[PDB]
């Protein structure tokens, strides 16, 4: 079983490839791989090459055409001795893509052919420097039959073609930007292609091509309008033009994550490309856009600039994310961006930085670099980048972004150099701050005000800690960037000021307990705290109710009105999940029901901040409200505030409903917001008196002319439990059975559904003509959605969602650990139950450990989380 490394055992590599020619042999048996790599030794003279591969077919080595007898294969290497300075490296080897299931290197997705190569995919390609700090000039030819495979891709420009007999032909491919080989990518295959133009606002034409299997086509252009507006927006905000001549994107069916940003070519997960308003929602359409973009940023926070080692995976991924979510922000509702984004951190990655697997999002050991993909690198790293942004402010961040890209452009660099950058061309100190570099789980902030009116200042005493978590037991203060704004009796901001002089509303929460004195406050103010959500931490304030109300009536950030909401609801979740485990049924104050209809009926209100308080927090987002989760009595909790709010609010959310009807389908941000809040109303009238919902949910199935419209109604008729919830999951499965990205939503559903019987339902799913083991698509929307996001069946009392985990787990284990590892999150999150189910979830980790070839993907959770 494989040793942990450990970032601090970074050492410069005492070899470097600077070109590398390679070619391709392509069959789906077995492929031909022929590498001719120019190496340079950089360490001591008697240092040996030491090259990864697995899996790997070696026939032979030569070192200046000379057949070399000095190496070794040992166990994921091959170890060449005795080499001089300089050397031309030719190895020659084959591979199975058809035998590769784990969809890392080159493997087959439906009759393609396609990669792979991030984290360490490569070394199952060839022998090679398989690390992001030894960058090379690839050049690429690929020879293949030309019926199977009349497309032919790889990084960069074409610069040879030919035909061969016995119908094959090749071409070859040169990438003028030198890149770590996780950037590698080979696409075979026969396509329909999109192609169109961006000019960049240099006069630099690009050419943009769209490739997606045949018959696809209609669901192309919103991928690439996204890819246009990502390349215009990065010039806009960043400054930053495209640096080739070509664009390819190729949407492909099988692929575990969501998409790759190999240079020139990137490969997308076909949920992320393809679209049109009968088979994609509101939220797909925005999707897309988010991850076209995502894949589009990083061509300069990436691959321009990569990483100089996988510790140091957050300086691109934080970065990015950071990016996509401007570029989301930018165009779109800023606001519901944020929240979103702000549910997904309190909601998913909050859970994970109190897990066994927590890490800081430069995390200092890993045994499976697969394993670091993660919502704390990505999503916590954004919100750190976030935390730069905030203070130095949008002029110095930019400035910094310009001084990284001259100091590091075309090296690989470290999350500290990105730091360094900000700091010294900002001017503002940043020491302290690195410390959310290297510290895991969540700060806590306690805030304690005192208003004075014999004095006329307001003060609070913050404070912080973070709690221990299994990998570090020292913890120390951050630097938290904790925005503030304070509000008179009339809604108006109070200037905050101190000693004469204005305060910036972005206080410096620096210490474990600091006050902080605000003079010239005449009328005792309601604090706005933590704004925006200024820093990833949990906010300890004991809120009046009515605080809250005023806050989501007055305002100025609507950001500030939703998490207000979130308050006032919070201690109500809290308060009924300890009445429904005695059984007691759902106690609601009067007042809090109405401070959702004002929300309702306020006209001024923009309705894509309406419908966000109106969405109810997720069951993910109840449970980091507990130190002991119940998710039992979260989800029935969760059902019986929705019915008491459909009760109380019955007339207020038709009427609503109703007046936001819109007859013409956009995809336009003003369109979006008005049905997300048409569509979040029905959600409430969904569990109405039975006959009238069952009525309003059935037609608005039926009568929709966009999937947006018609899932929604359909999530409603599974959520409910309606009458016609049968008949139309058999309609939506008879006509769309054919397609798998649309039937993901259908199984999504039926994982999710709150039926008695939802567990047998998914197990019968498991033969369903539409699923199937061999997709990862398909895996996460049945069993992953069933364990992840139905937690009230996974944890059913009898144990039953742990075996069935454990079968799903026992077979993809050998098929492909990475979507075994996605879906074993659930099970090692055991601590936070009760000790009966600990005790079953134990017993499933320990058969699990005891698998015949257990991954190292899922022996590195499972031995945390059995600890
Ligand atoms: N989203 C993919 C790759 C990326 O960051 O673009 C992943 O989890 O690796
Ligand atoms: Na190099
Ligand atoms: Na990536
Ligand atoms: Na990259
Ligand atoms: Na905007
Ligand atoms: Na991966
Ligand atoms: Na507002
Ligand atoms: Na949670
Ligand atoms: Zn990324």
Redesign the pocket.
Known sequence: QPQAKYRHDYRAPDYQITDIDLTFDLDAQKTVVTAVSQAVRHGASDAPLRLNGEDLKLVSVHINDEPWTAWKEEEGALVISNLPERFTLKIINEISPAANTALEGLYQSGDALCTQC?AEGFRHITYYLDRPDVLARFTTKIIADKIKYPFLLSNGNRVAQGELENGRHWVQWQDPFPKPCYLFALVAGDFDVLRDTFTTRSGREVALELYVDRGNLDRAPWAMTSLKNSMKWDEERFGLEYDLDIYMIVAVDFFN?????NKGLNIFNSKYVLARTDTATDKDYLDIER?IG??YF?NWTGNRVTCRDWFQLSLK?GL?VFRDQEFSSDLGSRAVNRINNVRTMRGLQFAEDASPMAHPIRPDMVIEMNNF?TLTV?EKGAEVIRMIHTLLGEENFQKGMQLYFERHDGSAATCDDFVQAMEDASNVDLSHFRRWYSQSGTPIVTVKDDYNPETEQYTLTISQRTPATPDQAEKQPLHIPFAIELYDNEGKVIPLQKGGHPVNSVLNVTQAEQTFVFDNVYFQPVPALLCEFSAPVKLEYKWSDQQLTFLMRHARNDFSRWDAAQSLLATYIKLNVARHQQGQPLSLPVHVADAFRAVLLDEKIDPALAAEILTLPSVNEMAELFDIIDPIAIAEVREALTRTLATELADELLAIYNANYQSEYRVEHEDIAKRTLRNACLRFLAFGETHLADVLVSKQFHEANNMTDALAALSAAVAAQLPCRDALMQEYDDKWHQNGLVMDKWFILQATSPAANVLETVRGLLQHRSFTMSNPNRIRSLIGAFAGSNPAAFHAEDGSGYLFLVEMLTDLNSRNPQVASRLIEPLIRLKRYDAKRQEKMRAALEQLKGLENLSGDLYEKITKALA
Do not use: K, W
Request: proline share 0%; aromatic share 14%.
């Open positions: 991030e994550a969501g998409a790759m940003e991850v995502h894949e990083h991924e990015t993909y990505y």
